[PDB]
Every structure is written in C-alpha cells, then in structure tokens.
Design a protein around this ligand. Structure first.
Ligand SMILES: [Mg+2]
Ligand SMILES: [Mg+2]
Lengths: 229, 101, 138, 84, 132
C-alpha cells in the first residue's frame, strides 16, 4: 500500500542525506512519476515534494509539473483539486522561458491542454498556449502525435467556447499550417457554425474537408447534409 | 574505367610525376647554375637521368577528360572542341553563348 | 491570432576592444546578366540606405572574351563556330564604415548574392603609425 | 484560497545554499551521462520550421560557409609567423 | 546545313518543349542557361570541376528518376550550396518521390561535400511549346 511505499521512499531520502548526497532534479521527478500509481493517496504528498524542491533551490521543470497534473487529474467529474492545481501552476509558469532539463519536459503541454478541455476553460487554454508561444517554448510541444493531440484538444475547445468570428481566425491559422484536422474536429467546427447561425460557410467546410482527406468519412458527410437540409 | 588505355597511361604519368616532383626539382637546381663545381653538376646530371622515364613532366598530355582526344582541347574546361560544343550548344555551360559581332 | 508573444533576439555583446575603421569598401560584382546586376544593385543600395551607409554606384566597362572552334568533326577548316563569354560589372563603393557595420552589411548582401554572380570586396582599413616608427632608435 | 506552493514540506533534505564548488570536468562522461544528454536534446528536437532555420542548422553543423566570406577560413599554416 | 542541337521539322506531330525547340544561336536571346555558377566569369577559377559536376548530376538524376523528368534540370550554385531544380511528372507515387529526394540529397551531399537540395516541380504532362 501507499503508506508502506511512502515510508520506503522517505527512508531512501534519509539515507541520501546521511551519505552527504545532494538530490538533483531527476531525484524529485522520479518520486512524482512513481507516485502516479497511488493516484488519490499521493496528491498531498506529491505537493509536499514540490514544496521541498522550491525550498532546496531545485527549480521545477516542465516535467515536474507534468507529473503533478497527471497525478491530480484522474477520471473525476468535479475536478475541484485539479482546477486549483492547474490555475496555480499556470500563474507560476507565466512568461517563463524553459530549457531542456528532464527527458519528460516535452509532455507538459499536451497534458496541460487536456486538463483545459476537461475543465472547459478557454481563458486557461489561452494561457497554456501563450506559454507555448513565448520565446522558444514552442520546441517542447513534442513528437508528431503529441502535437496533433495538443492542437486537437485546443481547437475543439476554441470552437465550443469562443465566438465564431474568432474561431474562424484560429481555423485559418492552425489548419493546415500547424496540423491536419481529424474528421471529428470538422464536425465540431460544423456544430459551432450551426450554433452561431452562420451556415453560409458550410460549403467551404466541405471543400476543406475533401482537401484534408475526409472525402469518404461517413460521419462527416452525414452531418453536413443534415445541417444543410 | 578510363576512356581508353591512352588516358590510363597519362593517368599513371601524372601520378608518377607528382611523386617525383620534389626530388626532380632539387636535383635540377643543382644543375641549373654556374656556382657549384662541374664535377658535382655532372653527378646530378646522371642522377636525374636515372629517374623513371614516366616521372618526366614533359611526357604528360592534356587529353580531353571525357573522350581522351589529345588535340583540340580547351585548357580552361579540359574538354575537346567536339565535347565542349556539345555542352555549349545545349545551354549547359554557364554564361557561354554564340559570338556574333 | 496565433502570433508569438515574445521573440528571442540574437545576443550582440559590446566588446572592450576598439573597432576597425574602413575608409572604403569597393564591392565589385561580376555577372553574365545585366538585369540581375540591376536588381542586386537596387537591393544593395536600398540595404545601405536603411542601415545608414554612404553608397555610390558606378558601372565598370564590360569584358567580352571570344574564341573560335572548328565547326565540323573532321576537315573543313574554313568553317568555324565562335563563342563568347560576357562579364558585366557593377561597383558598389561604400565609405566611412566601421568594422561591425561592414561585417553586418557584407554578410547580408553576400548571403543574398544571386547564382552566377561573383564578388570582390576591397577593404581599405584606416590604421595608425606603429609604435616603433614614432621616433628613431639610433 | 491557498497557493499550492505554501504549506507543509518534506524536511528530509536541508536547504542547499550553493552547488558543488568544482565539478569533475577532467573526468570523462560515462556512457550513461552521454546517453542522458542525448535525451535532453530529443525533448527540444523539432522539424525545421522555415528556410532560415535550415541555414542556421547547416551553419552550426559546419556544412554551410560562415559569412562574411573569409577565403582562409579553417586554414592556418600551423600558426607560423611571417619571420618563419 | 547546321545540325547542333536542332530538332528538325517533321510532319507536324512531334511535340517539342520550349528548351529543345530553340537552336544554339538563341542561348542568350530567347532561352537562358541551364546552369548558373561563377566558374566562367572573367578571373574566376575551377570552371573545369564545375563542368564535370554538371555532367554527372544530369546523368545521375536521369537514372535516379527514370521516366519522371519532364524537362532538363536547372543547376544553381550559390556559395557553398547546390540547388537542383527538376520538373517531374505526376505518375510516380508521392512516397517514392520523397524517398528519392531524401536519398539523392544525402548521397550527393556526401559525394560533393556540400549541402545539396532538390526542388521538384510536378506537371500533369510534358509542356508542349509547339508541334514540329
Ligand atoms: Mg606536350
Ligand atoms: Mg556553314
């Protein structure tokens, strides 16, 4: 159980101090990564580990916060603790240029955007994306499949929670230059156009859909026809 | 894989001449002056004459690098007049046009 | 909307060593095509004006090299094909530059030197008398 | 209304005022250190974004010439002096 | 009669491109040069090595993209860079084009010790200037 594992970990930390061994950033990042198994019991302990880092002087990297949000963000409807964590993390990370410190630094942005979609907070999503755009932070987005997930969750949240006039600006900037849309994201864009009563754009969405490899997607073709008729 | 045996013989001459160039330069300097004794200059005369025949630079021939033509070669491009014209008339040599004036 | 919030500017560090002084840079450029040299001149003059450099442009006389070849593969000596290579010039003369300014401008225009155009940059450097020559030792 | 950074902390590790005064620079890195430094490069690795980035990469790799052009770049005659 | 690089009139059914339709006396009047470098400028060196490289590259690309090239190559040299501009057809699959671009750019960079780029322009069919 967690309590026994926590005691063991703490015992190793006490062995580390006894041997005059100074902990590095990876020491704390592994603890947080290990603490993911006991998701609901390690939340407060994990926060204690983070608070210890700042006191010692080890600066949390993107990987550190990635592990925390993954630990705090489990399948729960309230997301009350998750709400507080992400808001506080974003306030701390605002306008911070990052450099590669831990191999898991590239996984923060996809996880941060996933929580923003779960909370359905567009202002938080713009803060996460703002952090990506400052300086050279854009290079931490990660491999291709990470980039597609991040942008899928990001654009799906824009369409749902923002005015149509701004959604169409984000649509033009991100597609195709940033990512190629999934067939489901075109459906979300069509639904956003419906809610806004801007159905003169539906013919354009079809043309773009054919250009992005969704010509023969049954779900997309049925949605467009139904909305038009 | 050189164009022909004649090109291959010139390839070997250019290689041997390169290998012996310093030794040939040093011995010739001993001969090409009136300062040193004639007895010493006579020994140098024999020494340079005993070097392999294909080390002598005068035996090198500027053949066309593409076809091995020994005459009609333009030194700037190392091409025979027939091969140079083939490339020039097709517009494949930068800046070379037909001259009319 | 998707605009970078902040941009990392390249670091330029003012050194503690005095900069070189250039009385003149003579940027001569050679090209087979005149229109290309005209476009490059417009680029280089516009770049100099925006950077505050004093630039004067003149066109040195062109050089045409002509040579004759035999037209037929065999015999028929009377028949010849004559070829030419035209080298056109444009001389961009900068004045009163500093080592740092010259480095920036030269890199900018040399990186944008179009294919088939060469350059010869003559850099006159202002210098002071060597310490030894200040007075005779004898 | 409580910040996540303020609260109880683990006091096992004491506050380190400074880092190690002198690292073992002379000692060569082990295979693990070399391999870990390659993973730190991977997190920041992205595809070339535009033409300027390609030129920057080549310049750092040494494939592209460094401007302004110097015709003696990379060639020194064994640091010999004129008097030699 | 002159022969050099002249496509000769037939019955009006031979499609010729713009390049091959112009005889050598038009090389600086109606058509340009297929290669641009500084070797042949006054006072410039290494015209011979640039020429050999051009001859090889044109043959390498002809065999590496067999049946794909729709017209002659345009070889460009800027400083250290070599840029090959090829007009190819739209018959070979895109996957095979990407493989051959990555392969040829790498193989040629290691052969001529310089950064080499290959810029492909696709056409549906050969562009016919006239029917001779
Ligand atoms: Mg001879
Ligand atoms: Mg005649």
């Amino acid at each position: 159980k967690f309590e026994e594992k926590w005691s063991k970990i703490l015992e190793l930390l006490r062995h580390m101090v006894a041997q005059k061994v100074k902990p590095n950033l990876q020491t704390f990042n592994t603890i947080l990564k290990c603490l993911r198994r006991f998701h609901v019991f390690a939340r407060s302990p994990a926060l204690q580990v983070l608070r210890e880092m700042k006191a010692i002087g080890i600066e949390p990297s993107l990987a550190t916060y990635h592990h925390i949000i993954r630990l705090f963000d489990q399948p729960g409807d309230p997301l009350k603790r998750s709400s507080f964590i992400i808001y506080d993390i974003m306030n701390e990370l605002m306008g911070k240029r990052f450099s590669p410190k831990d191999p898991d630094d590239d996984k923060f942005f996809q996880s941060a955007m996933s929580i923003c979609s779960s909370l359905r907070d567009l202002e938080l999503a713009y803060q996460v994306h703002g952090l990506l755009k400052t300086g050279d932070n854009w290079k931490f987005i990660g491999p291709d499949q990470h980039r597609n997930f991040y942008y899928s969750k990001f654009f799906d949240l824009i369409c749902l929670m923002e005015q149509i006039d701004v959604t169409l600006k984000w649509y033009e900037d991100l597609i195709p230059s940033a990512y190629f849309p999934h067939s489901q994201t075109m459906i979300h864009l069509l639904q956003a156009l419906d809610v806004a009563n801007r159905l003169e754009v539906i013919p354009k969405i079809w043309k773009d859909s054919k250009e992005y490899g969704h010509t023969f997607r049954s779900d997309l073709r049925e949605e467009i026809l139904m909305l038009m008729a | 894989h050189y164009v022909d045996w004649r090109m291959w013989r010139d390839v070997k001459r250019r290689k041997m001449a390169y290998e012996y160039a310093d030794e040939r330069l040093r011995i010739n300097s001993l001969r090409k002056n009136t300062i040193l004794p004639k007895i010493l200059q006579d020994v140098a005369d024999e020494e340079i004459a005993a070097l392999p025949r294909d080390s002598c630079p005068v035996r090198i021939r500027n053949r066309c690098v593409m076809t091995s033509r020994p005459r009609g070669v333009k030194r700037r491009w190392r091409l025979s007049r027939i091969v140079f014209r083939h490339l020039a008339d097709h517009g494949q040599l930068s800046g070379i046009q037909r001259a009319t004036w | 909307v998707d605009v970078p919030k902040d941009l990392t500017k390249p670091v330029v560090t003012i050194s503690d060593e005095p900069d070189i002084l250039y009385k003149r840079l003579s940027v001569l450029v050679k090209g087979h095509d005149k229109a290309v040299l005209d476009s490059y001149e417009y680029f280089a003059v516009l770049a100099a004006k925006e950077l505050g450099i004093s630039i004067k442009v003149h066109e040195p006389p062109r050089k045409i090299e002509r040579f004759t070849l035999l037209q037929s593969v065999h015999i028929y000596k009377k028949h010849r094909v004559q070829y030419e290579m035209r080298t056109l010039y444009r001389c961009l003369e900068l004045e009163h530059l500093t080592g740092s300014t010259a480095d920036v401008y030269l890199e900018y225009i040399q990186r944008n030197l179009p294919e088939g155009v060469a350059m010869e940059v003559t850099k006159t450097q202002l210098e002071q008398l060597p310490e030894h020559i200040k007075e005779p030792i004898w | 209304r409580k910040n996540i950074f303020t609260g109880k902390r683990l006091n096992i590790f004491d506050m380190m005022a400074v880092t190690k005064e002198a690292p073992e620079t002379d000692t060569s890195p082990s295979l693990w250190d070399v391999e870990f430094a390659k993973q730190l490069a991977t997190v920041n690795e992205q595809p070339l974004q535009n033409g300027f980035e390609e030129l920057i990469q080549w310049t750092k790799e040494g494939k592209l010439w460094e401007f302004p052009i110097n015709n003696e770049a990379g060639f020194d005659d064994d640091g010999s002096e004129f008097h030699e | 009669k002159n022969r050099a690089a002249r496509v000769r009139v037939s019955k009006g059914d031979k499609p010729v491109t713009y390049e091959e339709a112009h005889a050598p006396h038009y090389i600086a009047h109606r058509k340009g040069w297929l290669s641009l470098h500084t070797g042949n400028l006054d006072g410039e060196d290494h015209a011979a090595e640039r020429t050999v490289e051009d001859v090889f590259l044109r043959k390498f690309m002809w065999g590496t993209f067999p049946g794909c090239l729709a017209d002659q190559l345009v070889l460009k040299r800027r400083g250290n860079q070599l840029e090959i501009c090829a007009v190819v057809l739209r018959q070979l699959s895109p996957h095979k084009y990407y493989f051959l671009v990555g392969y040829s750019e790498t193989l040629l960079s290691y052969f001529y010790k310089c950064p080499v780029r290959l810029h492909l322009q696709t056409v549906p069919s050969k562009v016919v200037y006239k029917y001779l």
